Design a protein around this ligand. Structure first.
Ligand code: GDP
Ligand code: GDP
Ligand code: GDP
Ligand code: GDP
Ligand code: GDP
Ligand code: GDP
Lengths: 151, 151, 151, 152, 151, 151
């Protein structure tokens, strides 16, 4: 399961507050493999589909508008248990519940400005990756650090 | 809500071990707004009042003497849920119980040298702010990061 | 000329050594604006054109092959004097001549593994940007830090 | 020795707004200098005109004053051997385009009008600037435990 | 109990991934006292004895082979509750269970490459210290930070 | 060439001020290979020999006494031009002349407390290595990062 992949996006607040490198560095130092990366301005149409599961929620409309309000950094990361572990590194949805050491615990205050999205499951990750990236934007490369991260 | 304030003080051990910048930087990167700051030598009289609720505890007298033994950095920080969140950033009173990622978890060993004080509630914060600062030392400024920390 | 842009690329050694976030963070903290970003595997054809001015140099062939051997992170950064200033942040071509504090001074040893490319002039930057990015990959966003970086 | 030399430093409003107060303080701490005074204040135009009196004839004087008064500043006094000259080196050239990486301005700024921090340019300026911004009872003497490991 | 000691070792993955400084720095900033340090290539015989309690486990053989595959940084740290607290800083054996903020939580993925060993009790620490170090490699020095870490 | 070695020692001030990890990390991130490491309490006799060339200087006596006053971290690092480049990373003998970005420029004030020693030439390095280390304390290991630092 070392080829598992997750979709992460730095939300517009992360770009505006200059935390892109900080966030990328946390996934690098953890040992995951970066397999796709781009800075994009997502359309409302794409974001509506990205957050389809939340269409009934009262914040859906403002969440979509906000995620479209500025650039996001879309990413795919690969490694064993990357989906679950990425969620742990990011921390709870509401930063007030995310402990220090997590991204949201260290860098945010409020649920509407919580810096980053990560897929919530392997199935969501597959859907999100296909939605945001073409297949030719996902790169296979020989990772020399693999020998020192895996048994 | 977002105008809530807490009182923090770097204790003399924090100054002596050169952790003032490190501590301030953790509150900055979290998103909170610095509204007051000074290096002072607090009197025993002020400290007796600051720690009034601990008058019956066996360590009261040495706690007061210690907090008066050297400079402290007094601070006020503003933001949503700043009192509770500041306590979480700092970690448990006893550093042995404070997880890594918190200030006391990362930087201290023993309860009598635990680097920093934060208000334990909104009501204590109001009392502590008034005790340590005059009203004209609390500054209102237009925070340009506000749009990216709050809805 | 606050709208000046430069092309930067993290070379394969930078990706392999997990210094992408570190590098991006240095440009962020300096105040420059990230306007394009992607992880790509560049073709030999593109790299031959990228390094056209070096066609007569003895290392040209291996430089092309090497830059095509693995993923690169291509970037565009915007700000006053960004081309010249980025070169200063990166440091001399030969890391042995790059002082500590620069990227190559802090992280590299030898000229062939020197982590990063930056455009050497405004004219080179224009050519390099057009070569590596389509116009719709360069984003305009309203920068909230701008008031505090520029008069 | 000259180990009791003092300098005046101020984080300018851009430094506060960009959340670089801790970063800046940390650089002076890790260098070994002793923090002897600190406060967050909103300086008046009158004080700033006097602070920058030597620049009254310069074309940017007016905008410099207005800007330094536009937001909170962190005023500081640091103590140590050669602290005035060495602080200037840590900060870097006035124009960030001339400040090398490793300096504060080299690492964190772009333009001369937004260059994060002020440091005294000489011992005499430092004495004047300290007196202008601080009362004597805001400068603290404390016994520095790291002193044995910074000095002979 | 401020003279309690623990044995820590950076495993070969920690050396290869260049995390020795990072690891040492976390113990320094916590306040503990470094009392012994060396880079060694441990023999399989020593490692078999080190991990004697795990002789029946299925991974014993590969654990021994791996710990002998490269240099290790052997260390002794001294301070109040250093054994238990070191374990907390390192995090759970399986990095998937170690929260962000811990060494394994921040830097590792899998139990077979988990960066570092720490003694699990005072008695194990005594045994491990004697096994890896001669008495004349353990140094007593006067710690100037002690006044600011201990009541 | 790439097998050149230098002797470095963190002086007692570096240990006391908790900068060992910070120092090691700078040599790691630069790309050099750690081939020996130990914490020792050097005798006055060894230090007199270490600094033999300075016997006539007025500060010789106090330099010896001071270097013997607490633990030092002795190290050997390997790589291309490591002797000269280590000196550049360390900075000028007198920290007042060492630019920010160097170890002494970032962390010290005065020549008598300047944190670290590095060999001043290849010949001094050979002498210093033999003086401080037995041959069996210098390790050969296969460095996986070498592919990304060297041609
Ligand atoms: N304004 C607002 N946004 C919310 C709230 N709950 C969730 N969100 C946003 O919706 C995104 C997705 O919600 P969810 O899938 O439950 O959480 P996540 O997996 O941690 O992002 C979050 O990342 C938030 O930005 C809420 O109560 N209010
Ligand atoms: N010496 C000593 N100080 C203690 C003890 N318990 C609490 N304190 C101190 O009392 C201060 C305030 O106590 P408390 O209200 O429990 O906690 P705090 O809000 O975590 O600071 C702490 O910050 C500690 O330094 C104890 O058993 N001994
Ligand atoms: N192997 C090798 N590579 C070189 C040499 N000179 C330059 N290069 C490579 O070619 C790249 C581009 O050369 P140039 O633009 O002169 O330098 P830059 O602007 O500092 O990158 C450098 O960054 C190196 O990767 C050399 O003498 N040998
Ligand atoms: N806008 C602008 N400000 C300037 C210029 N030259 C100097 N300054 C400002 O004047 C302040 C004090 O002047 P100076 O003594 O030259 O600089 P400093 O000692 O490095 O602060 C600087 O810190 C700048 O913010 C200039 O050409 N234009
Ligand atoms: N390869 C492998 N090693 C394991 C496994 N379980 C434990 N270990 C190793 O055993 C070492 C010591 O075992 P234990 O005391 O249970 O863990 P520790 O105290 O966290 O080191 C760990 O540090 C791991 O490297 C496993 O399932 N596979
Ligand atoms: N106290 C004192 N030590 C000095 C002086 N000049 C040199 N040293 C010390 O001598 C050591 C070795 O001498 P040198 O070769 O000049 O310096 P290094 O190679 O940078 O270590 C230095 O590391 C200093 O601590 C001086 O004027 N006074």
């Amino acid at each position: 399961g070392a080829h598992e992949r997750t979709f992460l996006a730095v939300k517009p607040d992360g770009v505006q507050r200059r935390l892109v490198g900080e966030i990328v560095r946390r996934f690098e130092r953890k040992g995951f493999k970066l397999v796709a990366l781009k800075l994009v301005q997502a359309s409302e149409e794409l974001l509506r589909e990205h957050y389809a599961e939340l269409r009934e929620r009262p914040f859906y409309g403002r969440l979509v508008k906000y995620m479209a309000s500025g650039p996001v950094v879309a990413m795919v990361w690969q490694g064993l248990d990357v989906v679950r572990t990425s969620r742990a590194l990011i921390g709870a949805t509401n930063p007030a519940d995310a402990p220090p050491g997590t991204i949201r615990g260290d860098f945010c205050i409020e649920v509407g400005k919580n810096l980053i999205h990560g897929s919530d499951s392997v199935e969501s990750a597959r859907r999100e990756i296909a939605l945001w990236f073409r297949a030719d934007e996902l790169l296979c490369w020989e990772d020399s650090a693999g020998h020192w991260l895996y048994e």
